[PDB]
Amino acid sequence: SIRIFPRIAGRSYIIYGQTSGIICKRMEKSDNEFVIYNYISEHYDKFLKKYVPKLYGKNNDMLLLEDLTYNYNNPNVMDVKIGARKRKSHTSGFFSIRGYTNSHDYKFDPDEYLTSESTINHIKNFMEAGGENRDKTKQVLLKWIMKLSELANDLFEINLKFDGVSLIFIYDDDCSKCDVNVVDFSRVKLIDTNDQMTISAVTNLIKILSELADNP
Numbered sequence: 001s002i003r004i005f006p007r008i009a010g011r012s013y014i015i016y017g018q019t020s021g022i023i024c025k026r027m028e029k030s031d032n033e034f035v036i037y038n039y040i041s042e043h044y045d046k047f048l049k050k051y052v053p054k055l056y057g058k059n060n061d062m063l064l065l066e067d068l069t070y071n072y073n074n075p076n077v078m079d080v081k082i083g084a085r086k087r088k089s090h091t092s093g094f095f096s097i098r099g100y101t102n103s104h105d106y107k108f109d110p111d112e113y114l115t116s117e118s119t120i121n122h123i124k125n126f127m128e129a130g131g132e133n134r135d136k137t138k139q140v141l142l143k144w145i146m147k148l149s150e151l152a153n154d155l156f157e158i159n160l161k162f163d164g165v166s167l168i169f170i171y172d173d174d175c176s177k178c179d180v181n182v183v184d185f186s187r188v189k190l191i192d193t194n195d196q197m198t199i200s201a202v203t204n205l206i207k208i209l210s211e212l213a214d215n216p
């Protein structure tokens, strides 16, 4: 029977597949998320390959998605909202941390508006599972910067409003593996320009992670 997937943020009904390495996400309201996966697949295959979890297929209202945590022994996950919010402004100005592994233990609240200092403290909290090993965490930060830089650069040539999309940052406890990918295309729209709001979210994140990777 059904094992609920340990979501770290959001609200969607997400379960493990009956099969390894697959999560099933229930679309609500409409199939827009499906329409946008297919739209990206046709018009921007490279963006889809580099940055988005594989969509293996559809089953009524369920998207069969690549489990981004599957290849990790001890995954640590952070959801950061980089697309425009529906109704409220971002909790950290240009982006909103939505949740992370053990976030409740540090009294993280997705509704709390944060200063620069609290924003950095929460990312430091996310990184705490990495240990004191100062220069294996540095390697995790640098690989995140590498991919976020390419993403911000590719977003200039992509005519989509990434309303509501999140970065999912993932690192193993042993810091042997990490990655970051974009998810939640539920509210993404066609436009005839690039999304400067979303670009500014990635560049601000790159700035913050760079300051972390550097400081002694």
Ligand SMILES: Nc1ncnc2c1ncn2[C@@H]1O[C@H](COP(=O)(O)OP(=O)(O)O)[C@@H](O)[C@H]1O
Residues within 6 Å of the ligand: 006, 007, 008, 009, 010, 011, 012, 013, 014, 023, 053, 065, 066, 067, 068, 069, 077, 079, 099, 166, 168, 183, 184, 185, 186
């Ligand atoms: N492909 C994925 N692999 C692993 N975890 C995922 C994946 N997609 C979503 N998640 C988890 O689900 C949460 C919410 O997913 P999201 O697509 O934002 O849906 P919603 O906001 O509608 O609940 C994320 O914070 C993350 O923990």
Ligand SMILES: O=P(O)(O)O[C@@H]1[C@H](O)[C@H](O)[C@@H](OP(=O)(O)O)[C@H](OP(=O)(O)O)[C@H]1O
Residues within 6 Å of the ligand: 009, 010, 011, 012, 081, 084, 085, 086, 087, 088, 098, 163, 164, 166, 184
């Ligand atoms: O249900 P509605 O009325 O469309 O409201 C949105 C819905 O709850 C989304 O699932 C949520 O994204 P998350 O699940 O990723 O939080 C989004 O947050 P945002 O506005 O912070 O994108 C809400 O505005």
Ligand SMILES: [Mg+2]
Residues within 6 Å of the ligand: 010, 164, 166, 183, 184
């Ligand atoms: Mg979401």
Ligand SMILES: [Mg+2]
Residues within 6 Å of the ligand: none
């Ligand atoms: Mg709702």
